[PDB]
Structure formats: structure tokens, C-alpha cells
Design an enzyme around this catalytic site. Structure first.
Site, short mmCIF file in Angstrom:
data_model
loop_
_atom_site.label_atom_id
_atom_site.label_comp_id
_atom_site.label_asym_id
_atom_site.label_seq_id
_atom_site.Cartn_x
_atom_site.Cartn_y
_atom_site.Cartn_z
N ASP A 141 0.70 -1.19 -0.13
CA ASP A 141 -0.01 -0.04 -0.09
C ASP A 141 0.86 1.15 0.05
O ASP A 141 0.47 2.22 -0.71
CB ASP A 141 -1.02 -0.06 1.05
CG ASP A 141 -1.87 -1.16 0.97
OD1 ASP A 141 -2.23 -1.64 0.18
OD2 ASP A 141 -2.18 -1.59 2.33
N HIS A 168 -4.96 -3.90 5.89
CA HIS A 168 -4.40 -4.24 4.49
C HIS A 168 -5.61 -4.43 3.54
O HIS A 168 -5.50 -4.70 2.42
CB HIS A 168 -3.64 -5.59 4.58
CG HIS A 168 -2.52 -5.53 3.42
ND1 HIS A 168 -1.85 -4.43 3.04
CD2 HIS A 168 -1.98 -6.56 2.57
CE1 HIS A 168 -1.19 -4.68 1.96
NE2 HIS A 168 -1.27 -5.86 1.81
#
Ligand SMILES: [Ag+]
Ligand SMILES: [Ag+]
Ligand SMILES: [Ag+]
Ligand SMILES: [Ag+]
EC number: 1.1.1.37
Length: 302
Positions: A141, A168
Site C-alpha cells: 500500500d 490491508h
């Protein structure tokens, strides 16, 4: 320093093992483990690269030979999900709890929001759980945010670092776009950037047309987090990385936040800083999903 990767035969493991063999500091050791018998030959192939990193591969049911003397254990096994990956995570972390119980454990297997809670519950059943040593790797990310933000604002991609907190899973990924130095976004730019960062995996699965997910950038993401921890484990200062860990509990038992890394894992859990009106709203609305993803993993072991 020795790093063991569990799940080395997969697409993520081979990309991870390739980048580590090239980027680990001189004198490091690299152990590859997976169930497929091709794994010792993956190491032999990587052993021909002229870097001062010793590498050996192991296959079969027993991961103990690869875990001997391991300082960092990166678990990238499983499919790219809770149905099939929960058992693999529980099995591998079980063997880690018997062999090298005080190593830093980095969970790459997804869903990271849930599999890290599985790993923690498995580690405490062995009387071994140290919340300073267990990390969910959320670096994909981070690097995805840097690529999108730099392309939008015309900056150099390597010179952009945006902090990402939360979890996540899609709704749980929260990029703190207001904290990027030197850059300012409109309220619509923040909205479009946040959704693209949250659905960036579907962008790759769709373009591959079912042939797989993001496997090389995830390997690049796991390699960055792996080398950051090795630097910290070698006495290097100022090493700050965001990872999914069990901390204060101000938002959830596990939460991705800035972590100053030291010689024993996380040294200090730095604050998430000042949040914008958008970032505060996204954080609160996501918390319910994060707690359920955590509860799913806790109930699996208990
Ligand atoms: Ag360690
Ligand atoms: Ag540690
Ligand atoms: Ag971050
Ligand atoms: Ag960070």
C-alpha cells in the site's frame, strides 16, 4: 543476520528471494522454504548470483532446517482466501514457535488483517508471543501510494513517501495524503487517490485476466520491509516503516501505524499524526471491518 522466507517457490517468494539475494548486506544468510521440491533448486539458481549472501533451499513438510538461526522469518506462502490460507499460516507459525521463537515474524500471506491475528494467537498458545516481533507487511500500500501520488503531481516516484495506516483490506487501507510534505491535494483528488489505492489489487487481477494477482510488486514490497528490519536489527537508526502490529489498541488490537524499528523489533510506535477531516472519517468508518477481520482470526485458533 539470517532471513528465512517460507513460501519461496510461489511467485511472491521467488521475487522476494531474488531481491533479497541482491540487496541483503554482505555476510547475510538467506534460507528458502516451501513445500514444492523445486525450492532447493530455486536457492541453487540464486546461489549463482555473485553477492556475499549465503543461500540454501529446503522442501517438504518440515520447515525446521530453514528456520535454524533465523533472525527474520518472512511468510509468503499460500494463495493470492481465509479458507485455504488460515491453515497454512497456522502451520508455519507453529513451526516458527518451536524453532526460532524470538525471531521477527513478517506475515505476507493474505488476508493480512486476519492472518496476523492467527499468528499472534498461535504464538501465545506456545507461550512465545511478543507483540514487538510480529508484523503484517503492508508496504505494498505504501509503494502503490507513492506511484499514484507522484504520477498525479509530476514528482519523482522515489522521492514521494506517503504514510498509510489502518489495515490491508480495501476499506481498511487509509493513506494519509494530508501528511505528504510539499504536496497538496483537492478534496476530489484525495477521494480519487484513496479509492485507487484501496482497489489497486483489483486493477492488477483485472489486467491479468485471472492469471494471478500482484506478485512482483508485492515481492518488491516485502523486500523493502525485509531490508528495513535487517537495517534496524543491525543497529541502524531512524528506520521508520508502517506495518500492521498489535499496539495501543486505541482503534483495534492490530493496527498499521508508523513504527520506529530497533534491534528487538519495533522500538517505538509513533503516532499517526494530525488527520484531515476526510482521513478521520475514513478511519472511524473502517474500524468495524477491521475488528471483524481480527475476530475472524482469533476465533480460528480459539
Ligand atoms: Ag529479530
Ligand atoms: Ag525481533
Ligand atoms: Ag504509513
Ligand atoms: Ag510509514
Amino acid at each position: 543476520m539470517k532471513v528465512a522466507v517460507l513460501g519461496a517457490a510461489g511467485g511472491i517468494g521467488q521475487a522476494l528471494a531474488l531481491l533479497l539475494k541482491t540487496q541483503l548486506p554482505s555476510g547475510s544468510e538467506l534460507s528458502l522454504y516451501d513445500i514444492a521440491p523445486v525450492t532447493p533448486g530455486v536457492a541453487v539458481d540464486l546461489s549463482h548470483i555473485p553477492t556475499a549472501v549465503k543461500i540454501k533451499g529446503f522442501s517438504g513438510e518440515d520447515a525446521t532446517p530453514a528456520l535454524e538461526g533465523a533472525d527474520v522469518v518472512l511468510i509468503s506462502a499460500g494463495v493470492a482466501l481465509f479458507n485455504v490460507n488460515a491453515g497454512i499460516v497456522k502451520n508455519l507459525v507453529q513451526q516458527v514457535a518451536k524453532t526460532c521463537p524470538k525471531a521477527c515474524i513478517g506475515i505476507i500471506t493474505n488476508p493480512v488483517n486476519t492472518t496476523v491475528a492467527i499468528a499472534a494467537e498461535v504464538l501465545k498458545k506456545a507461550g512465545v508471543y511478543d507483540k514487538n516481533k510480529l508484523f503484517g507487511v503492508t508496504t505494498l500500500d505504501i509503494i502503490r501510494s507513492n506511484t499514484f501520488v507522484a504520477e498525479l503531481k509530476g514528482k519523482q516516484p522515489g522521492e514521494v513517501e506517503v504514510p498509510v495506516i489502518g489495515g490491508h483490506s480495501g476499506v481498511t487501507i487509509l493513506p494519509l495524503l494530508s501528511q505528504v510534505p510539499g504536496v497538496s491535494f483537492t478534496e476530489q483528488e484525495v477521494a480519487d487517490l484513496t479509492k485507487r489505492i484501496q482497489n489497486a489489487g483489483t486493477e492488477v487481477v483485472e489486467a491479468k485476466a485471472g492469471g494471478g494477482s500482484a506478485t512482483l510488486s508485492m515481492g518488491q514490497a516485502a523486500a523493502r520491509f525485509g531490508l528495513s528490519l535487517v537495517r534496524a536489527l543491525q543497529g541502524e537508526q531512524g528506520v521508520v516503516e508502517c506495518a500492521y502490529v498489535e499496539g495501543d489498541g486505541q482503534y483495534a488490537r492490530f493496527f498499521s501505524q508508523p513504527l520506529l524499528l530497533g534491534k528487538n523489533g519495533v522500538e517505538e510506535r509513533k503516532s499517526i499524526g494530525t488527520l484531515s477531516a476526510f482521513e478521520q472519517n475514513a478511519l472511524e468508518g473502517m474500524l468495524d471491518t477491521l475488528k471483524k477481520d481480527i475476530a475472524l482470526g482469533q476465533e480460528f485458533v480459539n
